[PDB]
Structure formats: structure tokens, C-alpha cells
Design a protein around this ligand. Structure first.
Ligand SMILES: COC(=O)NCc1c(C(=O)O)n(Cc2cccc3ccccc23)c2ccc(F)cc12
Ligand SMILES: [Zn+2]
Length: 226
């Protein structure tokens, strides 16, 4: 998160910290959010050989009783995810066991409505990602308020698609999701509407988020069958 604030500790109890393991490199990290006691939603590009989820975290360097470190049994990457275009950048993680409900850990279920979100309004995104181009991931959960932009603002991303994705962040501000914030939720009036997907290496906003509304049928299908 660039140009944001430190979250009030445990104020976003659905937030998930993902450690992603691959065979031929060190750990990578993503965000995500708990939508059921045993399901986390994140980005498809956060897939790996194995993943561990930590719920209940604020400062991810300091172990505390709120932590729940949870095993992932299965990854459900969107079947049409494309590594070239980055279309359909969404994935569900099934946890081995159901998480405990505490003050610090809870679900963020979707409302019944899945209305298309138009440009204009302010939304908020959170994560443990880099706080600048040359800075490292944040030890503490950070968050920032960003503007939903008209789709033409993301035209320079040649594979951007308004039906599939949100265009997020006023180009006149530094404020942005960035590297390390992958998979984290964009909340608009308390409702998850986007997932951090990709942007520019130089951090100039806007960035591209998965439009959750488009994938509500697919999400429902996985949750009902597993
Ligand atoms: C768990 O594996 C990773 O994290 N891999 C690295 C990786 C990242 C990142 O470092 O998070 N992002 C988000 C991203 C990359 C650049 C500028 C951005 C600008 C804004 C927002 C996100 C941005 C990706 C997107 C697509 C992709 F195939 C790989 C990545
Ligand atoms: Zn605490």
C-alpha cells in the first residue's frame, strides 16, 4: 500500500496473509479475505505448490494469540485464468479446517445483490505490500482510500476489460495498491467489490482489480460443491 495509513489493529478481521511456496524459489506473499470459515478468496496469480494462511494478524513479525495459522488443502484457480492477459485473476482456497470465530477473525460474506459497480465512488483496500517502489513489504497492515475511475483511465493496460475488471486510483495521487498487495479486497461501502490484480512497475495509478460481481456464479458453484 502506497500513501496509506496503518490499519487499526484487527479492524479488518476477514483479512488473510498468504505465504506461497514454489519448488524453485523462496516464499512469496499475497493478501486475501475469509468469505467462509473454510474458504479464502484471492488472486489466481498467487497460486503455488502449497499455501499457508494466517488469520488474525496485524504486525506479521510479532506472534500473538489472535493468530490462526491454517493449512490449505486445495486451490481452486479460475479455469479460464490466462497468464498473458491476466483475465480471470481469481482463486478460492479451501482450508483444511474451519477457522475459529473471534473478535480478530471473522467472515465477510457477500450480500444477495451483485450489482455492477459504476465509476465515481471511493473504496478502500488493505494489505502488507510494498509502501514504495524501492521499499519492502510493510510489517503492519496498511490501508488506503482510492477512487473508482472511468474505464478509459486504464486504456493503457491493453488487455484491460471493463466488464471483467475495475480501474482503481486517481492518477493525480500517489495512493495505490502495489506489489505485495495482490489478492487483497477492495471494499466499497463495506462490500467486497474488487481483488488486487496488477498495475505498473513504477506504481503510477490507476491499478487493475478483478471485478468480483462477474465471478459471483463461479464462486457460488465452488462453495456449493465443496
Ligand atoms: C505471489 O506471486 C507474486 O506476487 N508474483 C509477483 C506479482 C505481483 C506482485 O509483486 O504483487 N503482482 C501484482 C503487481 C505487479 C506489478 C505491479 C503492480 C502494481 C499494482 C498492483 C499490483 C502489481 C503480479 C501480477 C501478476 C503476476 F503474474 C505476478 C505478480
Ligand atoms: Zn493483536
Amino acid at each position: 500500500i502506497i500513501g496509506g495509513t496503518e490499519s487499526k489493529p484487527h479492524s479488518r478481521p476477514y483479512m488473510a496473509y498468504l505465504e506461497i511456496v514454489t519448488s524453485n524459489g523462496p516464499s512469496k506473499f499475497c493478501g486475501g479475505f475469509l468469505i467462509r470459515r473454510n474458504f479464502v478468496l484471492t488472486a489466481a496469480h498467487c497460486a503455488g505448490r502449497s499455501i499457508t494462511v494466517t488469520l488474525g494478524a496485524h504486525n506479521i513479525t510479532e506472534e500473538e494469540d489472535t493468530w490462526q495459522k491454517l493449512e490449505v488443502i486445495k486451490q481452486f484457480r479460475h479455469p479460464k485464468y490466462n497468464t498473458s492477459t491476466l483475465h480471470h485473476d481469481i482463486m478460492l482456497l479451501k482450508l483444511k479446517e474451519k477457522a475459529s470465530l473471534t473478535l480478530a477473525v471473522g467472515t465477510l460474506p457477500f450480500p444477495s445483490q451483485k450489482n455492477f459497480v459504476p465509476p465515481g465512488r471511493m473504496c478502500r483496500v488493505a494489505g502488507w505490500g510494498r509502501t514504495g517502489v524501492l521499499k519492502p513489504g510493510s510489517d503492519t497492515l496498511q490501508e488506503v482510500k482510492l477512487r473508482l475511475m472511468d474505464p478509459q483511465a486504464c486504456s493503457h493496460f491493453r488487455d484491460f476489460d471493463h466488464n471483467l475488471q475495475l480501474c482503481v486510483g486517481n492518477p493525480r495521487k500517489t495512493k495505490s495498491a502495489f506489489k505485495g498487495d495482490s489478492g487483497g479486497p477492495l471494499l466499497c461501502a463495506g462490500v467486497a467489490q474488487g481483488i488486487v490484480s496488477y498495475g505498473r512497475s513504477d506504481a503510477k495509478p490507476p491499478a487493475v482489480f478483478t471485478r468480483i460481481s462477474h465471478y459471483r456464479p463461479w464462486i457460488n458453484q465452488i462453495l456449493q460443491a465443496n
